[PDB]
Amino acid sequence: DRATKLLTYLADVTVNGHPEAKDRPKPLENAARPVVPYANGNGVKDGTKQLLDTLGPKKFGEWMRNEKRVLLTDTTMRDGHQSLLATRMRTYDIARIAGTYSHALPNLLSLECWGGATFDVSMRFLTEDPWERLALIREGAPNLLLQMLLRGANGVGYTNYPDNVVKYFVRQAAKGGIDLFRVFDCLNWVENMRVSMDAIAEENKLCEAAICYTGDILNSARPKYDLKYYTNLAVELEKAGAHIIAVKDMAGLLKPAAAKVLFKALREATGLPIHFHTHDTSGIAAATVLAAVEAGVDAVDAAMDALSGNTSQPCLGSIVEALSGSERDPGLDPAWIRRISFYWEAVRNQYAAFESDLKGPASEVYLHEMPGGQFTNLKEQARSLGLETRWHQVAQAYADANQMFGDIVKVTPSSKVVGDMALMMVSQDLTVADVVSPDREVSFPESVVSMLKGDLGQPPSGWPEALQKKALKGEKPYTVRPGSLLKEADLDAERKVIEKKLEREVSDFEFASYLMYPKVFTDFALASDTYGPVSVLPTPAYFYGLADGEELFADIEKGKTLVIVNQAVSATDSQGMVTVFFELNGQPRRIKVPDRA
């Protein structure tokens, strides 16, 4: 029956395509099935996971600090496909390689493999459970730390959530297999990081409190984001009880010379270890990573070659190959990095529908400051409102818009607020001067009014008086922390409304999903109950179903594999229905679905 359901899905998509895929380019026909590399050996070597179990967090941070080799985080499973393929990478492809990482690269610090947009996108667009994805990775890689991106008070969403909800989700994140929380507030406002960090320590997990990098410390004329700004914030996050400090260079704006100064002062300001995250939009980000190493940074992020470069992280294989034989050599087999790259490359080819038209490097990023993760999002969106031809003015729009809001930190969610503003500015031909004008009738987005009201929090100086006094149009503003002014959700009451809605008891993880994404979880559950475990299908099947005569092997369960052949399709019938003719484990099956077209 769970099989009946999978046939139903396969039929529904063989006849009607997938909505996210049907509109876009399709993979090369000949196409190798990606092949998981045969692991050399039997057991897996103890690594950083077992160390955090022995040491606990504080002592684990200290261990990084004293460690001489540079430690590595692989982002391929998260920021990587988020940046190059709109976060569409499936569990099937992700989980399947975890064990290979475990055997072939036991020295790694962590796998960045959860959080960010994956939580939203897995359900909403990939019709699979992100907690299930996490478990599968936990299972395959019991020797590596598992890393998530946590948007501080925004959680895995886009608006600040009630304190008890941040508290609750973190508790669940932990029980699900998350070892390492890279947490960050989108305005670098510490006072809005406390509840989150405190919750991470309380579950006795790693609190890597991030500081988002913007501007240019070596430019005297841009004084707001100088070196003293960062060094204080580092000291402040230590006070607030970080186990590790990260520099989140979300836009890939930190330049090598700047690293060399920054990571020296940072290590001078705190004893806690330092972890550097950048994106490679400039085409120079590896330089900034290598500069950060020489200056003594304890840990860096990179993506597998095959999903590296451009708006992603810089190239893991080449960064490692650069350090090879150096005092700080991170002891990672290049041969194995390359076998895993060849696999991710074959995985990548299956997601052709989601490839951007981005050609290569751009120093334009120093002007606009858009985050690696955004960029392509905003460009398709600017396509959507008919602006593909005016894109470079939409980049000027973004930068003026930034200076308008007072020269702010721009990252999820804050970035989207700037994005939504830039698109309007171009569309309705508003200068920043026409934007802030008394006599000019502007109708701001539901996300601009929201942030000016005080919902993403508060920057250092506060918001600009005038821009806000127009943008609120009578709604009075608040400067207090958004979690303080939101009632503490009655958890036991919300769990009845979702359990009644679905006429069943949901798991504690499931209640977390609904808490973060009420409507999206509900739509996913209904899809779940209708199509079943769609996540066990290999990717070409999940997006295009089965060709005529195509044999499929699918493992609904454990060691229960199913042999599904699509042997024919019928014409559309009097009832508007189509019948797909499956052979399942040598047995005939007839499945009817609607001709939606």
Ligand X SMILES: O=C([O-])C(=O)[O-]
Closer CB to Mg ion, residue 67 or residue 191? 67
Binding of Cl ion by 125 (CB under 5 A): no
Residue number closest to ligand X, CB atom: 116
Q: Which helix (H) or strand (E) holds 147?
A: strand 145-150
3-state SS class at 124: helix
The C-alpha atoms of residue 183 and residue 180 are separated, in whole angstroms, by: 9
Contact characters 200-219, a second copy, x per CB under 8 A? ------------------xx
State yes or no: 24 annotated in a binding site.
no
Binding of Zn ion by 79 (CB under 5 A): yes
Catalytic residue among 12, 74, 79, 185: 79
Q: Tell me if residue 248 is catalytic.
A: yes
Neighbouring CB atoms inside 10 A of 441's CB total: 5
Min dist CB 112 to Zn ion, Å, is 9
208 beta partners? 182, 244
Binding of a second copy by 10 (CB under 8 A): no
How big is the CA angle at 293 (ends 290 and 299), to the nearest 5 degrees?
A: 110
Task: Please name which of 326, 263, 324, 331 lies closest in space to residue 298, comparing C-alpha atoms.
Answer: 263
Partner interacting with residue 162 (select from a second copy, ligand X, Zn ion, none; CB below 5-8 Å by kind): none
Partner interacting with residue 286 (select from a second copy, Zn ion, ligand X, none; CB below 5-8 Å by kind): a second copy
The C-alpha atoms of residue 333 and residue 352 are separated, in whole angstroms, by: 29
**Residue found by looking up tokens 């002007």 in the block:** 367
Closer CB to Zn ion, residue 79 or residue 305? 79
Among 48, 82, 310, 535, binds ligand X (CB under 6 A): 82
**Residue found by looking up tokens 């009014």 in the block:** 449
The C-alpha atoms of residue 422 and residue 430 are separated, in whole angstroms, by: 10
Task: Please name which of 284, 313, 281, 283 lies closest in space to residue 300, comparing C-alpha atoms.
Answer: 313
Partner interacting with residue 79 (select from Zn ion, Mg ion, Cl ion, none; CB below 5-8 Å by kind): Zn ion
DSSP string, 546-586: --TT-EEEEEEETTEEEEEEEEEEPPP-TTSEEEEEEEETT
How many positions of this chain bind Zn ion (CB under 5 A)? 1
State yes or no: 3 annotated in a binding site.
yes
* Interacting residues with a second copy between 321 and 340 (CB under 8 A): 321-322, 325-326, 334, 337-338
Catalytic residue among 248, 255, 410, 416: 248
Among 97, 146, 290, 536, binds a second copy (CB under 8 A): 290
Which residues does 63 contact at the CB level (< 8 Å), separation at least 6? 51, 55
Binding of a second copy by 287 (CB under 8 A): yes
The C-alpha atoms of residue 249 and residue 33 are separated, in whole angstroms, by: 35
DSSP structure class, residue 538: -
Which ranges of 206-327 would DSSP assign to H, the alpha helix?
227-239, 256-269, 285-294, 316-323
With contacts defined by CB under 5 A, name the span among 22-30, 283-291, 378-386, 513-521 that binds Cl ion.
Answer: 513-521
Among 137, 411, 423, 430, binds ligand X (CB under 6 A): 411
Q: Tell me if residue 12 is catalytic.
A: no
Binding of Mg ion by 62 (CB under 5 A): no
Query: What are the residue numbers of the active site?
Result: 79, 248, 412
Contacting positions for Mg ion (CB under 5 A): 65, 67, 298
Please give the annotated binding residues, written as ranges.
1-3, 64-65, 67, 78-79, 82, 151, 248, 277, 279, 298, 412
Please give the annotated binding residues for pyruvate, written as ranges.
78, 82, 151, 412
Contacting positions for Cl ion (CB under 5 A): 517-520
